[PDB]
Design a protein around this nucleic acid. Structure first.
Lengths: 374, 583, 86
DNA sequence: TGGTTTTTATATGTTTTGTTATGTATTGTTTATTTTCCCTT
DNA sequence: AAGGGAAAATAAACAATACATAACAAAACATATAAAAACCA
């Protein structure tokens, strides 16, 4: 077709005008209609059998790189892994099996806590991650002169934490492991600002990974200073079958990538029937409140106004015999809260509202495909 | 509820009982397992005393770049006694990073409050004032040892409520990131505090880029207010090179007499430090550390820079140092000058004593370029009053021999170019004690061609996956592995040879013709255990369905890498390519 | 066609340009000047408009007084009166 | 028991931040017509 | 060397999509006071 294939020469030469007769418009409906269960059947056979023996031998080669990375984490370098393929099974085998026992032995008993962080999850929140880090470090919380008139308490406590840890002994006491640092909810500027200032602290060791090809566009001179990555290419052509769970693969990637409701569809498939009857009751009651309050077909994502309050919800699931009391209700709610499939917050009157963060069209699709089959 | 589907879970991993060893250092045994354990731990602690001696001085340097900058801004913030007394003294800090603290005077019978405003703290003009009036009322009760409305009426009631007059200082942090409608309206708001007879305002602008960009943004009547007294103070780590010359000289003091710097390394330092002009000194330190980390990790001869370990010398050391290219040039020089064979044979390995006695001679030379560069930099400083020079490219042109061809640009060293002349001499065995990048490790680890390493692994992929020959005829798919590419690598060359907008279905058929039809269906049948998978294989439609399943997880993997746009939502039939190789 | 008239420079007409803005001869292009109530004036103060962030000489403006009105007010004895008509 | 202090529940206010709807501006798509130089002669 | 003729360019009408901002919601950040609850005493 084109004479040039790669340079700016190939960019300028392949972006030509195609004529209307020269366009061969074939709809993708002219294809074998593939069921979802045989999609998973053929994919799990090729991902577990096609090139294991090259990928296993490649993983034995780059396992000899592990003391060379550990020498870099003891010198204050954050450590970014790029390449083509899934880097997830590499990253949590290096950081849990190799890295964490060998820092602890070199500081002489228990291992270093290894907070790993799934950034391919589109529901990854930076305030919940920082809630986890202050449980592990237990920093001195922020005095009144330090909270500077609606200052950001997450950023202003890291800056107190840097000045504290500039005088502590140089010992790794946390390893935060960021899978897909350029993932959908973690590529935002408030998340990167958190993790850059948190990377200045030499007492915690950053081990991160990126999949997108324009990932270095995400760090300017100030963020690349605080990070000071050393970059490592680990191409291994792994399938990424866990990253292809929060995002529908039957639609080839036009599932909007930031919903999180497609990843919720995977969570419902292996639950209790009494935990699916509750969540079905929660969806159907909020679906009543979205069609009432909005008066609008178009996609608005469900928030606190459309949510059920908690004491009214306990009456709904006691008549349908899901929950016997308030505590057994709250014990099977929190498994949805930790996966952020349901949120609990209070309004301006004290009503404790429970609500599902998905749009109306994603809420009726989810109600029919997994929940209403019983 | 798997942990793989959660966000941010915490592992408390299990550590084994005891691995029988005090081997917990990241250095490995070199010489393919011929190096002793006592050499590995010696090379570890000889690294840390050469690493810490470098960072004890760099931390001393960085503490001087702030103590100088606190004092240079404080000479200029105070004592400009204007006789008109109805304006503010403005301090433009050209190119300043907003990470400098400003200490104000104590200076009793006067309050000196410092009010710092970031562009995140400035969404609009009333939020600039309610934070500024909170920061002075909170910092005046801190020095005092009822409530006030936070507005500019606190400035007029300041003597009537605290008894001392005021001197407030504004420190705008990222003024290139603030919008200039708000900062213009706030300077005009502070202009209304010049009727109160007991206050003086002082603005400090941390302009990271330019003054010419700022005066095109502010309105013209504000610049006429900012010009009654302003002071431009150039604040940079890169001005006059005077702090980059101190960190690089601090590096050459640590490796004086024990490590050399190749000019291929020094001009790499010199080129990469010019591509980042705002943060040079952290990036100068990062490259000198990672090359120093690289040396002690890879050279078994790293233990031979202190003379007490020369009495250890072994046989595998003797087989590896003699392939030094200067050492062959020395034996070549003894061939061409002295005809007989025995003195050259006493140098080589057939005399077991002589070669290891030959290496103890050449470790003690000073190798005097490290002191002579410090000699030139001090002499060219105080004699000629020259400030604007790199010591880095002075050290680079000194390694080559182009010293006087570098000094002629100042046109005042013509009476001194003969006494400063120095031709370097190639010492023997200097390749074993040196810092160089001829392998390409620093421009792969610190400065990688990121996207070009992605498309090369996609397109080529033979450099990545091992092509093995014995083990494949045993396994389930090794008849398929020699004839079929990995699907991300197969789809990328169909991606590469295509035009901008491509139909998915035509891109599916063009993918499908590349695959072997008989051996995919032979591979899908070679597992006898899955009954559900063998039922798909009996269908006549088996290859057309396996090819689509295998296509549309790679057309999915190319989207979240960013290689493919789905043009024109509501249509979902054709895609646009984002990424070209080579760019 | 013609003593001579000074042509003021690009840096000097900038002050003249900003006075015609503040005398309501030029308005910002699609601008909402004062809001109806206090909450709409508060919502607009937290939004950061585009014309603020684009450079000075690239802001699109519009016109309070059109040229056909501008010919009728300026007297016939001005030297600029011939240029109030295309 | 008893007063006093401290925490909590309830209640409202403030500022930042993120979502959505919509009118207008931009951009792509198709069809007719004209100019430019590559590839055969 | 001439020349055919297909690629490239231009224009114009129309459709489809993106964008700037208005309006608002909600969460973080903040204060207040009566009632509970410890708690000395």
């Amino acid at each position: 077709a084109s004479s040039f294939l790669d340079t700016f020469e190939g960019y300028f030469d392949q972006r030509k005008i195609v004529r209307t007769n020269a366009k061969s418009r074939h709809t993708m409906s002219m294809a074998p209609d593939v069921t979802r269960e045989e999609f998973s059947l053929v994919s799990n056979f090729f991902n577990e059998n096609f090139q294991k023996r090259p990928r296993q031998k490649l993983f034995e080669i780059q396992k000899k790189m592990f003391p060379q990375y550990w020498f870099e984490l003891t010198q204050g370098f954050s450590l970014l892994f790029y390449g083509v393929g899934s880097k997830r099974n590499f990253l949590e085998e290096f950081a849990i099996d190799y890295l964490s026992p060998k820092i602890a032995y070199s500081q002489l008993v228990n291992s270093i806590p290894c907070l790993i962080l799934n950034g391919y999850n589109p529901s990854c929140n930076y305030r919940d991650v920082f809630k986890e880090i202050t449980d592990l470090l237990v920093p001195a919380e922020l005095t009144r002169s330090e909270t500077k008139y609606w200052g950001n308490h997450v950023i202003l406590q890291i800056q107190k934490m840097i000045d504290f840890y500039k005088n502590q002994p140089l010992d790794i006491k946390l390893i935060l492991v960021v899978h897909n640092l350029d993932g959908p909810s973690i590529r935002k500027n408030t998340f990167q600002t958190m993790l850059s200032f948190l990377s200045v602290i030499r007492q915690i060791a950053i081990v991160a990974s990126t999949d997108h090809i324009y990932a270095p566009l995400l760090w300017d001179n100030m963020k690349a200073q605080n990070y000071n990555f050393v970059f490592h290419d680990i191409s291994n052509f792994e399938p990424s079958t866990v990253e292809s769970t929060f995002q529908d693969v039957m639609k080839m990637g036009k599932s909007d990538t930031s919903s999180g409701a497609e990843g919720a569809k995977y969570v419902l498939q292996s639950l209790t029937v009494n935990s699916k009857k509750m969540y079905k009751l929660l969806i159907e009651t909020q679906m009543q409140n979205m069609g009432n309050l909005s008066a609008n077909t178009g996609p608005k994502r469900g928030t606190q106004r459309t949510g059920v309050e908690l004491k009214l919800f306990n009456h709904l699931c006691a008549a349908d015999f899901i929950a016997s009391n308030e505590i057994a209700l709250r014990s099977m709610l929190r498994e949805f809260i930790e996966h952020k499939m349901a949120n609990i917050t209070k309004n301006n009157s004290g009503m404790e509202i429970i609500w599902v963060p998905y749009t109306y069209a994603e809420l009726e699709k989810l109600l029919k495909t997994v929940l209403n089959t019983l | 509820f798997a942990d793989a589907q959660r966000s941010h879970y915490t592992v408390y991993p299990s550590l084994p009982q005891s691995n029988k060893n005090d081997k917990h250092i990241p250095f490995v045994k070199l010489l393919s397992g011929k190096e002793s354990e006592v050499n590995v731990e010696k090379r570890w602690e000889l690294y840390h005393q050469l690493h810490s001696h470098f960072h004890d001085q760099v931390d001393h340097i960085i503490d001087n770049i702030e103590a100088d900058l606190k004092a240079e801004i404080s000479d200029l913030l105070y004592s400009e006694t204007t006789q008109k007394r109805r304006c503010f003294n403005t301090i433009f800090l050209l190119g300043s990073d907003s990470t400098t603290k400003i200490e104000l005077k104590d200076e009793s019978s006067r309050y000196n409050v410092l009010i710092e405003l970031t562009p995140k703290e400035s969404p609009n003009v009333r939020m600039m004032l309610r934070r500024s009036m909170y920061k002075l009322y909170s910092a005046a009760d801190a020095e005092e040892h009822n409530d006030v409305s936070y507005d500019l009426s606190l400035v007029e009631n300041f003597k009537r409520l605290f008894g001392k007059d005021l001197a407030m200082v504004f420190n705008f942090k990222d003024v290139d990131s603030i919008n200039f409608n708000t900062l213009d309206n706030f300077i005009i708001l502070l202009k209304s505090a010049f009727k109160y007879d007991h206050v003086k305002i002082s603005l400090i602008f941390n302009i990271n880029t330019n003054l010419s960009n700022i005066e095109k943004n502010l309105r013209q009547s504000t610049i006429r207010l900012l010009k009654r007294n302003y002071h431009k103070l150039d604040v940079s780590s890169n001005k006059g090179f005077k702090y980059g010359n101190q960190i690089f000289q601090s590096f050459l003091d640590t490796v004086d007499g024990k490590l050399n710097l190749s000019d291929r390394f020094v001009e790499f330092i010199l080129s990469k430090m010019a591509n980042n002009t705002n943060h040079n000194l952290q990036l100068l330190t990062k490259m000198l550390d990672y090359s120093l980390m690289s040396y002690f990790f890879q050279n078994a001869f790293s233990v031979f820079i202190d003379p007490v370990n020369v009495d250890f010398l072994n046989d595998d050391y003797l087989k590896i140092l003699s392939r030094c290219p200067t050492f062959m040039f020395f034996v070549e020089g003894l061939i061409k000058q002295h005809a007989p064979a025995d003195e050259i044979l006493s140098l080589l390995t057939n005399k077991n004593r002589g070669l290891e006695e030959f290496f103890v001679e050449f470790l003690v030379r000073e190798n005097p370029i490290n002191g002579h560069a410090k000699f030139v930099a001090r002499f060219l400083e105080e004699e000629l009053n020259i400030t604007n020079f790199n010591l880095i490219e002075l050290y680079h042109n000194l390694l080559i021999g182009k010293l006087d061809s570098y000094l002629d640009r100042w046109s005042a060293c013509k009476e001194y170019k003969d006494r400063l002349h120095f031709e370097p001499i190639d010492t023997i065995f200097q390749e074993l004690f040196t810092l160089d990048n001829r392998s390409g490790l620093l421009t792969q680890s610190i400065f990688p061609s990121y996207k070009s390493n992605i498309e090369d692994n996609l397109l080529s992929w033979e450099q990545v996956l091992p092509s093995l020959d014995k083990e494949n005829y045993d396994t389930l798919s090794g008849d398929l592995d020699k004839i079929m590419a990995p699907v991300l690598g197969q789809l990328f060359k169909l991606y590469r040879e295509a035009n901008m907008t491509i139909n998915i279905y035509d891109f599916y058929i063009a993918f499908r013709e590349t695959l072997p039809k008989e051996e995919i269906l032979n591979f899908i049948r070679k597992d006898p255990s899955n009954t559900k998978l063998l039922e798909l294989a009996e269908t006549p439609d088996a290859f057309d369905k396996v090819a689509l399943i295998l296509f549309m997880q790679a057309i999915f993997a190319f989207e979240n890498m960013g290689l493919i746009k789905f043009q024109s939502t509501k249509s979902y039939d054709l895609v646009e390519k984002c990424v070209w190789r080579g760019i | 066609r013609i003593n001579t008239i000074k042509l003021w420079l690009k840096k000097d007409v900038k002050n003249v340009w900003e006075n015609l803005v503040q005398l309501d001869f030029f308005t910002e292009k699609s601008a909402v000047g004062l809001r109806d109530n206090a909450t709409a004036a508060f919502y607009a103060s937290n939004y950061q408009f585009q014309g603020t962030m684009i450079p000075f000489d690239l802001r699109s403006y519009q016109m309070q007084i059109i040229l056909q009105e501008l010919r009728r007010i300026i007297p016939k004895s001005n030297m600029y009166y011939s240029w109030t008509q295309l």
